[PDB]
Design an enzyme around this catalytic site. Structure first.
Site, mmCIF file in Angstrom:
data_model
loop_
_atom_site.group_PDB
_atom_site.id
_atom_site.type_symbol
_atom_site.label_atom_id
_atom_site.label_comp_id
_atom_site.label_asym_id
_atom_site.label_seq_id
_atom_site.Cartn_x
_atom_site.Cartn_y
_atom_site.Cartn_z
ATOM 1 C CE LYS A 15 -3.659 1.785 2.706
ATOM 2 N NZ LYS A 15 -3.931 1.878 4.117
HETATM 3 N N1 LIG Z 1 -7.314 1.629 -3.911
HETATM 4 C C1 LIG Z 1 -5.999 1.550 -3.671
HETATM 5 N N2 LIG Z 1 -5.424 2.399 -2.801
HETATM 6 C C2 LIG Z 1 -4.068 2.185 -2.664
HETATM 7 C C3 LIG Z 1 -3.289 1.256 -3.282
HETATM 8 N N3 LIG Z 1 -1.947 1.369 -2.883
HETATM 9 C C4 LIG Z 1 -1.995 2.352 -2.029
HETATM 10 N N4 LIG Z 1 -3.230 2.896 -1.823
HETATM 11 C C5 LIG Z 1 -3.637 3.996 -0.977
HETATM 12 O O1 LIG Z 1 -4.296 3.400 0.181
HETATM 13 C C6 LIG Z 1 -5.380 4.240 0.506
HETATM 14 C C7 LIG Z 1 -6.335 3.507 1.419
HETATM 15 O O2 LIG Z 1 -7.188 4.303 2.251
HETATM 16 P P1 LIG Z 1 -6.741 4.520 3.798
HETATM 17 O O3 LIG Z 1 -6.361 3.270 4.366
HETATM 18 O O4 LIG Z 1 -7.842 5.331 4.431
HETATM 19 O O5 LIG Z 1 -5.424 5.474 3.663
HETATM 20 P P2 LIG Z 1 -5.230 7.106 3.550
HETATM 21 O O6 LIG Z 1 -6.112 7.664 2.557
HETATM 22 O O7 LIG Z 1 -3.716 7.353 3.377
HETATM 23 O O8 LIG Z 1 -5.669 7.656 5.036
HETATM 24 P P3 LIG Z 1 -5.176 7.337 6.530
HETATM 25 O O9 LIG Z 1 -5.407 5.857 6.667
HETATM 26 O O10 LIG Z 1 -6.077 8.166 7.387
HETATM 27 O O11 LIG Z 1 -3.766 7.731 6.534
HETATM 28 C C8 LIG Z 1 -5.927 4.635 -0.838
HETATM 29 O O12 LIG Z 1 -6.807 5.760 -0.794
HETATM 30 C C9 LIG Z 1 -4.702 4.901 -1.631
HETATM 31 O O13 LIG Z 1 -4.351 6.241 -1.451
HETATM 32 C C10 LIG Z 1 -3.894 0.355 -4.204
HETATM 33 O O14 LIG Z 1 -3.361 -0.521 -4.867
HETATM 34 N N5 LIG Z 1 -5.275 0.587 -4.326
#
Ligand SMILES: Nc1nc2c(ncn2[C@@H]2O[C@H](COP(=O)(O)OP(=O)(O)OP(=O)(O)O)[C@@H](O)[C@H]2O)c(=O)[nH]1
Length: 317
Positions: free
Chosen positions: A72
């Site tokens: 991620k």
């Molecule tokens: N959908 C998706 N998101 C990914 C992927 N790799 C990284 N991400 C990121 O992981 C996020 C997941 O949502 P959250 O777990 O809420 O992470 P965040 O938006 O950084 O927010 P916080 O958890 O509050 O830090 C996505 O919005 C992407 O920004 C992927 O392969 N798919």
């Protein structure tokens, strides 16, 4: 012209100067994306999924269905959008709150500008000390709606459109593609997750359905996992003695939820981690004026309690 405003995003000690697209120009691009992506959701949103944290209950589901896994990436979520505005070929990146910036690459193929909607992450390559745009998936490619096809088809479409693209050193983000690994290949995932964390900052792993169409919005079948027990929340200090509150967005009232040991400035936002029954201060957030909401709080508690780990999850296979 497209009405611009300049802006600088900072990620991982590095910064990018972008033109934030403003006013009616922003509004046209958004509307164009909403059309291309055939999204008739009454509230503006990116045409792509937001993950759910894995729970113990989902372990069954994963065992029955097919899924891919990836690191991620820790960066900013962007929908990448090629189009034409006022006859001009425009490559936009749009964030979750629907903020448009131009991100121009020299050599993008003109086919892409018939309408391309790719999903990804603007992030930093640690090795190279330059920014990267890592593509997760494609929704529309060169006008062709790919979203209802399965994952490999979409990648086949996306990778085809960019086959002849080469990034020149003066481009602002190196384009890269997420390498999705099947959940039934743990040894291939771990190695891929080891090599990935040499290039990027990750925050665990993403597990995605190999075959469902693209989901816009919360996707109860896209699972993220945070490595270990290191989840945090932002509370608002409701008292100088550290009564932390969590925001109830439909009361628009902060609700008293715990207390911290220390002296705190009322109204500040503290990032805290859970440890041994209580939340512990990690850092004050001078950039925020809002605590997290109840749902993020209620959900994070469950996650802490369940203590799923990457090694549990990778051992299931
Ligand atoms: N959908 C998706 N998101 C990914 C992927 N790799 C990284 N991400 C990121 O992981 C996020 C997941 O949502 P959250 O777990 O809420 O992470 P965040 O938006 O950084 O927010 P916080 O958890 O509050 O830090 C996505 O919005 C992407 O920004 C992927 O392969 N798919």
């Amino acid at each position: 012209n497209i009405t611009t405003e300049r802006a600088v995003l900072t990620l991982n000690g590095l910064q990018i100067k972008l033109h934030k697209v403003v006013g009616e120009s922003r509004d046209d691009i958004v509307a164009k994306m909403k059309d291309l992506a055939m999204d008739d959701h009454k509230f503006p949103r990116l045409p792509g999924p937001n993950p759910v944290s894995i729970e113990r209950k989902d372990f069954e589901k994963l065992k029955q269905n097919k899924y891919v896994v990836s690191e991620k990436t820790d960066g900013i979520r962007f929908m990448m959008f090629f189009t034409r505005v006022f006859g001009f070929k425009v490559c936009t990146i749009i964030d979750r709150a629907m903020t448009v910036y131009l991100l121009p690459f020299k050599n993008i193929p003109r086919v892409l500008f018939q309408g391309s909607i790719f999903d990804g992450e603007l992030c930093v390559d640690i090795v190279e000390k330059k920014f990267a745009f890592v593509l997760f998936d494609a929704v529309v490619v060169s006008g062709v709606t790919v979203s209802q096809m399965d994952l490999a088809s979409r990648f086949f479409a996306m990778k085809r459109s960019l086959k002849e693209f080469k990034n020149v050193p003066e481009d602002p983000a190196i384009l890269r593609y997420k390498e999705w690994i099947p959940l039934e290949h743990p040894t291939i995932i771990k190695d891929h997750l080891k090599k990935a964390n040499a290039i990027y900052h990750t925050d665990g792993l993403i597990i995605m359905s190999v075959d469902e169409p693209v989901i816009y919005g919360r996707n109860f079948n896209l699972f993220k996992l945070k490595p270990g027990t290191h989840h945090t929340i932002d509370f608002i200090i409701m008292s100088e003695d550290g009564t932390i509150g969590i925001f109830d967005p439909n009361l628009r009232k902060n609700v008293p939820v715990g207390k911290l040991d220390g002296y705190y400035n009322k109204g500040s936002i503290v990032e805290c981690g859970f440890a041994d029954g209580t939340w512990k201060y990690i850092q004050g957030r001078s950039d925020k004026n809002q605590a997290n909401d109840r749902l993020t709080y209620e959900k994070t508690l469950l996650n802490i309690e369940e203590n799923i780990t990457i090694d549990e999850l990778l051992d299931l296979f």
